[PDB]
Amino acid sequence: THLPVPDYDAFLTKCMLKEMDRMKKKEEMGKLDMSRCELPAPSAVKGVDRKLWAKVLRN
């Protein structure tokens, strides 16, 4: 009673609350996919999609 009760969620945003609750429930963090540096070529069954070819060149 001589010490305050802690507000563990002081200053946190609505976003950061859900992020705390993820690690509080012990789930892994999200990771960036880094395969864009290796950039596999498309196959023959996906080369019909013109956008899916441009998305390779633009990468």
Binding site: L3, P4, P6, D7, Y8, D9, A10, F11, L12, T13, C15, M16
Partner: protein, 90 residues
């Protein structure tokens, strides 16, 4: 481009900037204000005809706005972690 006149909230067709406030005014309003009062209605400064510098001038959220979003989130994580350290050391 187009701008909102700080005198009145109407669209601006001859934009000029109030140097003491950064407010954009239409020349047709601020010039007569300079004649009749020499000031501007929000900042209440002192302004003169020569200060009316005229203005002559993407889809994604730009990188500086996203880095500011991350910096803002960082500030809350620090301010929280400070409070928890403050409690924990006591």
């Amino acid at each position: 481009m187009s701008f909102v006149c700080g005198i009145s909230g109407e669209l601006t067709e001859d934009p000029v900037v109030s140097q003491v406030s950064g407010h954009i005014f239409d020349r047709r309003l601020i010039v007569k204000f300079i004649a009749e009062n020499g000031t501007d209605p929000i900042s209440h400064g002192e302004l003169s005809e020569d200060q009316l510098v005229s203005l002559k001038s993407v889809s994604g959220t730009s990188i500086p706005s996203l880095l500011k979003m991350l910096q803002d989130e960082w500030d809350t994580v620090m301010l929280n972690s400070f409070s928890l350290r403050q409690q924990l050391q006591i």
